[PDB]
Amino acid sequence: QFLQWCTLQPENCAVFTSDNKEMFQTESGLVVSTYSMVANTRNRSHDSQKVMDFLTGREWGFIILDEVHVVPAAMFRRVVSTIAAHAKLGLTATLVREDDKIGDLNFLIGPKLYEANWMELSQKGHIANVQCAEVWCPMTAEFYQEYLRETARKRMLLYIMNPTKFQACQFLIQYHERRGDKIIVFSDNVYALQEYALKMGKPFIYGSTPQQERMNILQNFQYNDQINTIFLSKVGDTSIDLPEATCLIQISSHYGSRRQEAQRLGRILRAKRRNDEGFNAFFYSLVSKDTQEMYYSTKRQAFLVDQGYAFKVITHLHGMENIPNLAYASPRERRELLQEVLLKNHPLIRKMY
């Protein structure tokens, strides 16, 4: 983005990463690095120690802290001390944390200089107009009994893995695929992500997936018309490159993470079809009824309603009985799915060795 938008030379630009560690030889320029590399208190390599010596010994004029919400962390905090910068600009979309340490940014970086009005940007067309909805999935009797008679870690997986959310997600996938939408289905639970993806015949990307397979699946999502839905784990929340998406379905979440909720909303807020009149992107949060997921979903949406978004509650999807292939409709298959969810949890001497 620097080399594209501004008249900065590649000889004036430098990158401090694992593969790239050479620095600019001019008297001034650009260096882009990561918080973990800068604040790595571990025993770093000699050349990276030399680069850190260069960064510390130079008096920097400007620092851009991208995703400044992670700055108040335990030792991401010290990157504003180890780098003596005259000006510090923290750029973010999600200025929330689930602890009270978000207010330490007034002492780390500075005061809250600017907040964008997301509704004003949406009505000016700078970001997409999203229809935020919360889809209530009533649990079955057997899954609710098992949800009551388990501890919290099994309870999480058991309200995620209910068949009603399978049916609602499958119906929404079919409906928006008929409408011609690029759909991202976010779920932090890896087992739930894989089970939904194998049940629905759509590709899934999570942490242990190889990078070449991830790039191939993302290219298929961007260009292939038969691949209109991708299932993403928490790899999709962090700043990775994603294709243009207009529909999003949130199956599971990481407790009441408002930052993750707004980061998921941001993946569809930048849709290309904003210039089309009457276009609307769609956000769905599929939540099991009468569980702690409702509590966590309200906690997550508390930040998005501060931005102006209204989450319409959907207790009924018209067409849930007319869908031909409904996942886990039969009681015997529901019992089988319950059983799977419950059963989830001197050089010569060297030849000896």
Partner 1 sequence: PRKLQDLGLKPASVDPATIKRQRKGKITNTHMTGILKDYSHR
Partner 2 sequence: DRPIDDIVKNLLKFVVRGFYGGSFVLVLDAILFHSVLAEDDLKQLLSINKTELGPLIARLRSDRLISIHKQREYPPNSKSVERVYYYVKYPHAIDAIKWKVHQVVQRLKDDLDKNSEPNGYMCPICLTKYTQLEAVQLLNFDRTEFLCSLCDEPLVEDDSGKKNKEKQDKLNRLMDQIQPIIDSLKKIDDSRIEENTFEIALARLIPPQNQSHAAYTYNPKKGSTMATLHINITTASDEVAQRELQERQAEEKRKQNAVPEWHKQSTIGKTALGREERENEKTLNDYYAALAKKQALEDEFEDV
Give the residues lining the site for partner 1 (CB under 8 A): 197-198, 201, 203-204, 208-210, 212-213, 216-217, 219-220, 222-224, 226-227
**Least separation in angstroms between CB 74 and partner 2:** 42
**Least separation in angstroms between CB 235 and partner 1:** 13
**Least separation in angstroms between CB 183 and partner 1:** 16
Q: Which of residues 315-334 bind partner 2 (CB under 8 A)?
A: 315-318, 320, 326, 329
HEC secondary structure over the chain: CHHHHCCCCCCCEEEECCCCCCCCCCCCCEEEECHHHHCCCCCCCHHHHHHHHHHHHCCEEEEEEECHHHCCCCCCCCHHHHCCEEEEEEECCCCCCCCHHHHHHHHHCCCCCCCCCHHHHHHHCCCCCEEEEEEEECCCHHHHHHHHCCCHHHHHHHHHCCHHHHHHHHHHHHHHHHCCCCEEEECCCHHHHHHHHHHHCCCEECCCCCHHHHHHHHHHHHHCCCCCEEEECHHHCCCCCCCCCCEEEECCCCCCCHHHHHHHHHCCCCCHHHHCCCCCEEEEEEEECCCHHHHHHHHHHHHHCCCCCCCEEECCCCCCCCCCCCCCCCHHHHHHHHHHHHHHCCCHHHHCC
**Least separation in angstroms between CB 1 and partner 1:** 19
Pattern of binders to partner 2 over 91-130, x per CB under 8 A?
Answer: ----------------------------------------
**Residue 168 binding result from partner 2, partner 1, none, given CB thresholds of 5 to 8 Å by partner type:** partner 2
**Least separation in angstroms between CB 78 and partner 2:** 46
The reply to whether 175 sits near partner 2 by the rule CB under 8 A is: yes
The reply to whether 168 sits near partner 2 by the rule CB under 8 A is: yes
The reply to whether 245 sits near partner 2 by the rule CB under 8 A is: no
Contact stretch for partner 2 (CB under 8 A) within 45-53, 172-180, 248-256, 339-347: 172-180
CA torsion 135→139→140→144, rounded to 10°? 180
**Residue 276 binding result from partner 2, partner 1, none, given CB thresholds of 5 to 8 Å by partner type:** partner 2
Q: What are phi and psi of 134, to 5 degrees?
A: -120, 115
Distance CA 305, CA 288 (A): 21
66 pairs with which residues across the strands?
Answer: 91
* 251 Cβ neighbours under 8 A, 6+ residues apart: 160, 165, 169, 185, 186, 187, 189, 192, 193, 196, 286
- Please identify which residue in 106, 180, 240, 305 interacts with partner 2, judged by CB under 8 A: 180
Contact stretch for partner 2 (CB under 8 A) within 9-17, 36-44, 74-82, 135-143: 135-143
- Please identify which residue in 42, 153, 312, 332 interacts with partner 2, judged by CB under 8 A: 312
Choice between 176 and 202, CB closer to partner 2? 176
Choice between 55 and 317, CB closer to partner 2? 317
What does R_g of the chain's alpha carbons equal in angstroms? 24
The reply to whether 282 sits near partner 2 by the rule CB under 8 A is: yes
Distance CA 228, CA 185 (A): 11
Choice between 203 and 236, CB closer to partner 1? 203
Choice between 213 and 276, CB closer to partner 2? 276
- Please identify which residue in 37, 70, 89, 133 interacts with partner 2, judged by CB under 8 A: 133
**Least separation in angstroms between CB 210 and partner 1:** 4
Q: Number of residues interacting with partner 2: please give it, by CB under 8 A.
A: 28
**Residue 156 binding result from partner 1, partner 2, none, given CB thresholds of 5 to 8 Å by partner type:** none
Question: Given the rule CB under 8 A, which residues bind partner 2?
Answer: 131, 133, 135-138, 163-164, 167-168, 175, 179-180, 276, 278-280, 282, 312-318, 320, 326, 329
